[PDB]
Design a protein around this ligand. Sequence first.
Ligand code: FES
Ligand SMILES: [K+]
Ligand SMILES: [K+]
Ligand SMILES: [Mg+2]
Ligand SMILES: [Mg+2]
Ligand SMILES: [Mg+2]
Ligand SMILES: [Mg+2]
Ligand SMILES: [Mg+2]
Ligand SMILES: [Mg+2]
Ligand SMILES: [Mg+2]
Ligand SMILES: [Mg+2]
Ligand SMILES: [Mg+2]
Ligand SMILES: [Mg+2]
Ligand SMILES: [Mg+2]
Ligand SMILES: [Mg+2]
Ligand SMILES: [Mg+2]
Ligand SMILES: [Mg+2]
Ligand SMILES: [Mg+2]
Ligand SMILES: [Mg+2]
Ligand SMILES: [Mg+2]
Ligand SMILES: [Mg+2]
Ligand SMILES: [Mg+2]
Ligand SMILES: [Mg+2]
Ligand SMILES: [Mg+2]
Ligand SMILES: [Mg+2]
Ligand SMILES: [Mg+2]
Ligand SMILES: [Mg+2]
Ligand SMILES: [Mg+2]
Ligand SMILES: [Mg+2]
Ligand SMILES: [Mg+2]
Ligand SMILES: [Mg+2]
Ligand SMILES: [Mg+2]
Ligand SMILES: [Mg+2]
Ligand SMILES: [Mg+2]
Ligand SMILES: [Mg+2]
Ligand SMILES: [Mg+2]
Ligand SMILES: [Mg+2]
Ligand SMILES: [Mg+2]
Ligand SMILES: [Mg+2]
Ligand SMILES: [Mg+2]
Ligand SMILES: [Mg+2]
Ligand SMILES: [Mg+2]
Ligand SMILES: [Mg+2]
Ligand SMILES: [Mg+2]
Lengths: 169, 77, 117, 109, 83, 213, 112
Amino acid sequence: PMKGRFPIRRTLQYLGQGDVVFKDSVKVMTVNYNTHGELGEGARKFVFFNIPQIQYKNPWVQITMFKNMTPSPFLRFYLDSGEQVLVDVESKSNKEIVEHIRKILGKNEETLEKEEQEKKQLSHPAHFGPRKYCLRECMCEVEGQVPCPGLVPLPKEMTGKYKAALKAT
Amino acid sequence: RKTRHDPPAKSKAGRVATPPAVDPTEFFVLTERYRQYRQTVRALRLEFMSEVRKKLHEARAGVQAERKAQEDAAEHR
Amino acid sequence: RAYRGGHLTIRLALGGCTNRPFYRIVAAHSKCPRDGRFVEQLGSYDPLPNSHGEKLVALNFDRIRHWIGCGAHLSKPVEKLLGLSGFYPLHPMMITNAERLRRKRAREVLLASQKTD
Amino acid sequence: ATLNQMHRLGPPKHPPGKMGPTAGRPQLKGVVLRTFIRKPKKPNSANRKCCRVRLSTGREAVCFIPGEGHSLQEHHVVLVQGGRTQDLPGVKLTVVRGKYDCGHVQKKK
Amino acid sequence: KARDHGLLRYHIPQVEPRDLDFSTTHGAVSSTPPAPTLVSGDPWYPWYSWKQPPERELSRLRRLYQGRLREESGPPPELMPEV
Amino acid sequence: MARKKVRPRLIAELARRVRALREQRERPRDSQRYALDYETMMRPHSGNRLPMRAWADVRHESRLLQLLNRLPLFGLGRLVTRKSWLWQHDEPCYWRLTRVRPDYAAENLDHGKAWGILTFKGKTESEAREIEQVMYHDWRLVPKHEEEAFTAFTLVPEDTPLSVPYPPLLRAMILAQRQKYGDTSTEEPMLNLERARIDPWDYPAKLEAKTKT
Amino acid sequence: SIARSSVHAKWVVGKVIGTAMQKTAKVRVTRLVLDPYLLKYFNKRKTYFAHDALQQCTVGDIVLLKALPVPRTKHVKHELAEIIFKVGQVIDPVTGKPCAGTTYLESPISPE
RNA sequence: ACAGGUUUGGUCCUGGCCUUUCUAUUAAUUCUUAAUAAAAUUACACAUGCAAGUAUCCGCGCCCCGGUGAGAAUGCCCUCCAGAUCUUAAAGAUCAAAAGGAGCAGGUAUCAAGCACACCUAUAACGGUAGCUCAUAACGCCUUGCUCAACCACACCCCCACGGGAAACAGCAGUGAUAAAAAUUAAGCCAUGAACGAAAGUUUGACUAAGUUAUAUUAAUUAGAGUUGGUAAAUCUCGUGCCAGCCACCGCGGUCAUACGAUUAACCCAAAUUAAUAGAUCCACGGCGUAAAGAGUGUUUAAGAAAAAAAAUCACAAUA
Ligand code: FES
Ligand SMILES: [K+]
Ligand SMILES: [K+]
Ligand SMILES: [Mg+2]
Ligand SMILES: [Mg+2]
Ligand SMILES: [Mg+2]
Ligand SMILES: [Mg+2]
Ligand SMILES: [Mg+2]
Ligand SMILES: [Mg+2]
Ligand SMILES: [Mg+2]
Ligand SMILES: [Mg+2]
Ligand SMILES: [Mg+2]
Ligand SMILES: [Mg+2]
Ligand SMILES: [Mg+2]
Ligand SMILES: [Mg+2]
Ligand SMILES: [Mg+2]
Ligand SMILES: [Mg+2]
Ligand SMILES: [Mg+2]
Ligand SMILES: [Mg+2]
Ligand SMILES: [Mg+2]
Ligand SMILES: [Mg+2]
Ligand SMILES: [Mg+2]
Ligand SMILES: [Mg+2]
Ligand SMILES: [Mg+2]
Ligand SMILES: [Mg+2]
Ligand SMILES: [Mg+2]
Ligand SMILES: [Mg+2]
Ligand SMILES: [Mg+2]
Ligand SMILES: [Mg+2]
Ligand SMILES: [Mg+2]
Ligand SMILES: [Mg+2]
Ligand SMILES: [Mg+2]
Ligand SMILES: [Mg+2]
Ligand SMILES: [Mg+2]
Ligand SMILES: [Mg+2]
Ligand SMILES: [Mg+2]
Ligand SMILES: [Mg+2]
Ligand SMILES: [Mg+2]
Ligand SMILES: [Mg+2]
Ligand SMILES: [Mg+2]
Ligand SMILES: [Mg+2]
Ligand SMILES: [Mg+2]
Ligand SMILES: [Mg+2]
Ligand SMILES: [Mg+2]
């Protein structure tokens, strides 16, 4: 990317390096911030940098912006059970907000690692089929077994043409 | 394969079936084996059925399930 | 595909090229084609012996009993295959074919000896 | 073209190719209607042996006979390709020699 | 072929051991106690062997399948000779 | 699934109503549906040919209604047996008729649907079930003086084993699991062959389905 | 305890467009969608119908919507929950004091 | 793209076309054998044979498999899921209609307005409100099966099929017509799959094993085709004389042609070679004084930016 103030933030790696996964009960995140004043530096930089990362890992979570409606910037979270979480940021920096959010509603490290561990067993190595879903496509791709007749022609004694000839004779 | 509405063939319209011959000694022994074979498999089938109920019940309202539910609720508060 | 009815069945799905059969132990709806969509693939069955003279069979025992527990029918060859492994008792037709082979072989031995003398 | 304008218009997509004189078919079969001679544009001057045939789609187009010498007459069946002759404007088909009623060029004897 | 005979050098990544715990105590690898029907030599199930049916049942089957009846056979041979 | 260009098809619903109305109005009667020619062994209505295993019984026996019409109240409370059970089962099997309604289409009144009480191998059920396989040419009627002879039954206890050994491979996993978890008992596992009782194939199935219980 | 809904959105926040119809407010929900080519997020606007029993909707408000367990028609599938920000009358959720943009209408450090 | 040929007397710049790479079909020339994969003109009309039976009568099954891409911007993903079926300890599972939506989804705005497309009360009437979709593309038009363990749709036609036209191979093989498109009117249920029977078992043009064809890949038994001015590997001797003819782009031939035709020699692929048509790929995160490009001007709506600092002007020919 050439255009833009920070073209690095518009690449796949930057969108993928942000690790903030909301719980299944989080649906709506509302962020209010001011475009003037030194107190809103943490909020504006959070919107300019971290929000694309948060949305990328949470495609089903609505994110809405509101500018210059409340003198004190804040974040509001709406849960599935109607619970409302209010986060107040007036001097916290860009990094502080992400760490604060990751603890109140983010998922634990043990939960994330065990989630993908259970996903691995879906692609069981012992299955056969297409390359997109299974490793091997046929039993002939296993050393020791009888190879595919296309590569190495089979012996005449096993060919069905020879088997039928002797039966009819 | 044929469909419901198509007419049947003409040559094979007179015959119905021709059952094969029955060996008296062999058939009775085979019938006895099937009766015991079906009974044994049925007990195994019901045994597996109860196993599924046990596994499903533990996943829904198992002791560990209550522990997990209370832990997240306690952490959230 | 939306079918009128049908029953869940564990069967063998053919594969491989000509003169080289290869069956996959799969569980699919009875009304779907042999190589059609399936729920879960259980194992595999190599019909041809390898250099060691072994016919490899793969079974997903914990998953196999799960589908049988929920009411899955079994075809003729899978029952014989399971009977050989010992998960199920020997099929009655497996034993009868064995007995027929002995009697035919006994007749063959007697027939050859009678002509010899 | 700023970011907003590029987003609105979407990525540029190559348009599909326009069908040629043969309507996308590699070869066509036609019936000879008239045989005449067409002359090229300068600085190339000659007497090019052309023909006017009606294709299987019903349209009537001008075609060209490659090689030296031909025995094509009216109401003959020939096969036409999709090649083009640079010297002759308008002509965009060539008869493939050796099929149906047109044979290969005859060696001098 | 040369790399398989060691005549040519090629990269050999370090590989971790296949199993985490090396225990032979489990019954999959250790010998299980013999079945009561295994030591005795009796077949695993009573119906595996051949039993002579009662003559009354044979008469009933002949009446039911009269006309299309086939020749009966006795007990199968215990061991099959080689041609 | 749906789209914004859905067209309100009406002929398909119109055909469904008429087709459903037609079959109800033109419902075939039991007499004409089961009328059979005794020479070609071909059903004129359905166009079906009976299997050769049933040719002998048709010409050498009569169905239920043929032996039931010549009775005062169509044999209410009578005992009806069937040739199929008699040939294969030494124990008496019979039906105690509760109600029967023949169809008036038949000129000879040889068709109809009947109910009864089931008595299989001396076991009597406490509910009435519709009689299955009425049209079969194998039914017989017991006499009044022989009613008590067949009614009397000698109860013989079952000698089948109540437990059988597990299959060999499946038996090993049972031992392996308890040994792994600490249960070191060497008692041989057994399979409870008590809940897997199988009725004989000749036992008639319930024609009526089962509602939610 | 079966009071679920078939829609993919349970709770949404949108801006009120108009209150022309009777006891129903048309709101505009905004969500961020990633453009596959530019890898940038742009707002996507969708219109939702919310049932207001008390007729408390004014054009320009921000309203939280709750999924309706049973649709009342082919379009109204959401019910109003609360008025997050009344137009022109905005109270700061932190200090609980009226405010007009950046300047506080009432000083929070003056209890009396 | 590692780029190359081509504007001009000539250089630089901008900007098209074409070459070089890979896959498929047909045709030309040529062709020895074996194996595997695949088999494709046509939703046009079809002779004949076959493709659903099983079973002690009841019953169950009978485009399920298979076939096709006509139709529809259809759809993909996803939420919910009645109902049918299987199993049984009546609560588990397989398939999933209808309905619904976070997002994604061909071309065209010279298709810009559609014209009832909304909602409330209670009723499931009546009455009341005057709204709804749309320049982030409504409403139209044109083209089209697909995002592939597979999915969606059609089953002679009148979107449907009471009815009517009318008398059906888009099941295998085969035939007519048509098209540049050319498999056997064959064998068996031995395996597997499906239907039925308690069961031995039966049926099965699905399939299995074969027949046919350089369509692709491999091995070997097999040798011809194209090209030789430049981009781009490679030639001489004759004939012809802007003539007959050649070229993918630039061009050649006007009595001394390495470009036409033939010959000698050479180059490059090889049981294939070359040509023709489609497809992969390819435009702008680049530009707007002179090149295609800042619209004659200002304000405002939709929308979007603010983030550090700082900013109400003014002798003079505005205008009416
Ligand atoms: S691909 Fe495995 S036998 Fe051919
Ligand atoms: K160029
Ligand atoms: K078969
Ligand atoms: Mg194959
Ligand atoms: Mg050319
Ligand atoms: Mg040129
Ligand atoms: Mg020819
Ligand atoms: Mg029938
Ligand atoms: Mg110039
Ligand atoms: Mg020049
Ligand atoms: Mg050809
Ligand atoms: Mg061949
Ligand atoms: Mg029966
Ligand atoms: Mg298909
Ligand atoms: Mg087509
Ligand atoms: Mg079409
Ligand atoms: Mg259309
Ligand atoms: Mg559905
Ligand atoms: Mg349900
Ligand atoms: Mg249910
Ligand atoms: Mg139709
Ligand atoms: Mg048909
Ligand atoms: Mg047709
Ligand atoms: Mg055909
Ligand atoms: Mg023909
Ligand atoms: Mg072809
Ligand atoms: Mg031909
Ligand atoms: Mg022939
Ligand atoms: Mg046949
Ligand atoms: Mg046979
Ligand atoms: Mg069979
Ligand atoms: Mg069965
Ligand atoms: Mg073949
Ligand atoms: Mg040559
Ligand atoms: Mg040439
Ligand atoms: Mg000369
Ligand atoms: Mg050249
Ligand atoms: Mg030459
Ligand atoms: Mg200009
Ligand atoms: Mg300019
Ligand atoms: Mg301008
Ligand atoms: Mg302007
Ligand atoms: Mg504004
Ligand atoms: Mg004036």
